[PDB]
Design a protein around this ligand. Sequence first.
Ligand SMILES: [Cl-]
Ligand SMILES: [Cl-]
Lengths: 486, 485
Amino acid sequence: CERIVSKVSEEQKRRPLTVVVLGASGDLAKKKTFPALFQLYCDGLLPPQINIVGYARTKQDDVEKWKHETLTKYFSRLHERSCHVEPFLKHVTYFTGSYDKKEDFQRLDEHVSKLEDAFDGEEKAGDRLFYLALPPSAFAGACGSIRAGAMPREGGWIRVIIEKPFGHDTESSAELSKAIEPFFDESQIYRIDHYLGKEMVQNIITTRFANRIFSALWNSNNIACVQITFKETIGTEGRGGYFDSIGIIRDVMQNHLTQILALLAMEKPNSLDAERIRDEKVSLLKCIAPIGKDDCVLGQYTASADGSIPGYLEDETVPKGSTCPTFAVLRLHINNDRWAGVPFILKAGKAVEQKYVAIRIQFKDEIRPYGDAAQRNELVIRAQPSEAMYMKITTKMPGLNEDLRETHQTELDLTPDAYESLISDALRGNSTNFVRKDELDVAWRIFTPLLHQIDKGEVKPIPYQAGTRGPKEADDFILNSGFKFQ
Amino acid sequence: CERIVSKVSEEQKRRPLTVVVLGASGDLAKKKTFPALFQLYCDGLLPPQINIVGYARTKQDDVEKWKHETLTKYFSRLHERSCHVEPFLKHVTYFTGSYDKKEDFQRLDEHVSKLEDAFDGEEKAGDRLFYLALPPSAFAGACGSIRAGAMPREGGWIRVIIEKPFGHDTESSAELSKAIEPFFDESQIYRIDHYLGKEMVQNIITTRFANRIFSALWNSNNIACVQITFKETIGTEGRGGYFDSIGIIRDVMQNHLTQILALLAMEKPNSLDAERIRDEKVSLLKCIAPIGKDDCVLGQYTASADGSIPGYLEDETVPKGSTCPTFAVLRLHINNDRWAGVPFILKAGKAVEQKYVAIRIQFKDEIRPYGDAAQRNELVIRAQPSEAMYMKITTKMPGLNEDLRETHQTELDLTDAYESLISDALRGNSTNFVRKDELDVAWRIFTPLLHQIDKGEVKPIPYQAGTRGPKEADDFILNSGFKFQ
Ligand SMILES: [Cl-]
Ligand SMILES: [Cl-]
C-alpha cells in the first residue's frame, strides 16, 4: 500500500475546508473532478479533515451506495491506491438541490456548517471552495445563489471554479463575465483552461525564464518562426451536431493554443507572483492584431478512404451545407519589439495523420560558413502523446570525413491529471494557471472577427480525406509564412 | 569477415603513392602509425597500389618476420578485419639506414623509384609522404636529408609529418622551425597535435558555427567562465625520468588543451578553407597574455596509500629534489570583445581521481524571476572516457508542486585520431595540423611561466595519488569565478 505522507502545509490544516462540487451527477464531476480529489487525497495534498459535498439535482437514497457504485467506477490507479478508497469516501457527503434557488443554498450552508462545526479545532468558520461542474447557462444562476445563501462564516475565504466554455465570441463571453461581476471579484473566481494544468505547459515559464540559454535566444534576432499544433486522428464520432456550433477554432485554438502562445511569447515577469505572470500574459495578448481571413486556411474532413472514418458531412446530426471547420491553420502577428516580423502559426485539426500536441520553434539559419550544409535549429516541446523536449542541431558526420561540410542533424533530448494540479492551486490561492477576466476578453477579440466571417459564410473550408494531413493549401500557407519544413 | 570498398577518388589513383615511416622500430610507429595505416587500408581510404616503406636503423634479414611480430602486434579489430592483414603486409617494404646521412636517402629514392616504376599506369611520378616518428633531435637532420636525396619526380608532391614535441619553449621551438624552413615550406609540413584528430575536437567548429543556438550564446554576455580539463588516473608508470624534463604543462596543456582552447574561443572563419580556420586560431591566441605565476597552481603526486600507484619521487629515473609538476591549473585572460572578463581555466593532472577529458562552459545566472531556485546553465563536451555533449538546465520539478520555485536541474543530452590525421595529410588538408605561427604564439603564452618553474620560482604542492589534487587548486578555481555544481 502507501502511508499517506501529508504534504499539506500546517497553515492549511487549521480551519475547516469544504469543497462543494455542484453537478455531482454530471459526467465531468465523476470522470474528472472526484477522481482528481481522490488523487489529491492519496498524494497527501488535502488537509486532514476536508469535507467534500456532492451537490446535484437528482436525489439518491443510496447515500453510501452512490459513493461506491458510480464514483469509484471512473477512479484510477486501483492496483496501488485501492487501500485508501474507503478513508477518502469517509470525507464525501451528498446534498440534493437545485442550482439556482437561494433557499436550497441556505440549506446547504447549514448542512456544511454542521460539517464545519465537527472539525477538530477552535476555528469553525471554514474555507469554502465551489466547483461548478455545470453547463455554462447555470454559471450565473449558481453564482448568485451561492452569494445569497452559502457564503462562509466570518473569516475563511470563498472561491468559485468555473470551466470552459465562456461564451462563443467577444459579446457572449463579456456578458457571462458581466453577470458574475456582482457576485464575486477576480480574486474569488478561478476560470479553468485545463491545458494550464498540464506539465509541459507549466514548464514553459521555467524553461524560458530560469535558464540563460533559453533567455538569450528567445526573440526575433534568433527565432525565424513559431508553430503550435493540435492534431487528432479521430473525427466527430457521431456528435457532429454538437461540434458544428463550436468548430475547431473555438474548441481548441482560441483557448488552449492561445494560452500556450501567451506563455511562449510573453515578457519576463519581475517575480513569480501570480498576478505579475497574468499581467504579462494579458500584456502579450494585447500586441496581437485580430486574425484576418487572409491569415487562415480552413478544412472539413471527408471519408477515410478505407471507410474506417466516415465524412463529417456524412453525419445526419450535421446540417447539410455546413461551413463548420474541422481543420484550421492561422497566422498571428505579435506587434512588439521581441516578436515583430516573426510568424506565429496555430494549427489544429481533427481526423489527421496522427495524435499530437507540440510546440515547434524554428531558429534562423546560421548562413556562414556552412550554408546548405547546415539547417535551421529547432526547439520542440511535445505535450501529447508522450512528453518530450529536444533541440535539433547540426553536427559533424561521425567517422572519417573528407571535409567539414559533411554534417548531419542530431538531437539534444531531455532526460498527474491537470485537474489535480489546478484544484490544488485553487486550494492554496494560486491563480497563476487560471484565466483572468481581461485575459479572456483580449483573447476573444483576436479570433471573434474571423469567427463571425466564418459563420456568415465568407470563408469556405477545403475538403480533405480523414487520415491525411489536411488541405494541401494549408501546408503551402505554412511554407509561404516563413517555415522551412525538413 | 568483410570485403573492402575503395572510397579513394580517381584523382588519387593516377600516380604512385609512397609512405615512408622513419623510425619504424619506435614505439609510436608500431603503436600508432602502422595500426592507423592498416585501418586506412581496411576502410578503403588507401589507393589500390600504395607502397609503405618501414625506415629504421635496425637491420632485419627476416623482413617477413618483422611484419608479424613487431608491426602487427599493436593492430586492432583483428576478429573482423584480419581477412586483410596479410594482403596489407604485401604493401609493406623494409629499408634500413640512418636518419641523417644524405647517401642513405639517395638509396631510398632509387628504392622508392623502383616501386614507382612498378605502378600500373602511364604516370610514374609518385607522391611521397614522410612520417617522422623520431625523437626531436632527428627532425632537422632527417628533413635536410629528405630534401637532398629523396624528393619526388617533377610530377608529384611531398609532405612531411612531424610529431611532438616542437621545442620546449619559445626560443627552442623557433629554432626548430628555423632549421626546417630551408628544406620545406608550410604547405609541405604537417605538424601533428593528435587531439586535433579526435571527433569531439573536430566537432567544436561545426557545433559553434553551424547552429544559431550556440552562435548567439557564445560570448561574454552569456558565458561566465570556461574550463578545459585533462584528468588521468595513472602516474608516470616508471617512465618518470622522461616525464621529469617535460612536465604537465608541456605534456598536455601547451599543445592539446590550447588547441581545444583555440577552437572553442576563435572567431568565425569567413569560409571553411583550411587556412581561414588556422588564421582564426592564430588570431585568437594573440589575444592571450602570458600566464603569470599568480594564475597557476602546481602539484606533484605522492603515494596513493591504496597499496598501489607509488609516489612520483619514488621513481629511480626521477632526479631527487625535482620541482616537476604532475598537476597544473592555469587561468588565462583573452583580451578581445568576445571574451573580455571571462575566466578560462586549463586543468591537467596525472594520478587523479578519474580519467577524463572535457570542456565545461558555465553560463551566467538568470537572476530574475527564479533567483536561488535556478542554477547556472552549463554546456559540457566530453572526449574521454565516453564521448558526450549535454546541456544542464533548470526545469520545473515533475509532478504536483506547490510553487514554480520547486525546480530541479535536468539535462539535454546529445543522442582513431592518427587515422583521421594521416588521411587528411594524404589529401593535402592542413586544417587539423599546427601551422608555424600558431606554434609560436602558443609557446609565448606559457614560456615566461615555464622559465619561472624551471628557475624554481614556483613550487608544486604535494597531493595523494587518486585524490582530486591540491586543495589550493579547487580554491583557485572558486576564486576565479567558477560555481561548483
Ligand atoms: Cl522532428
Ligand atoms: Cl555533470
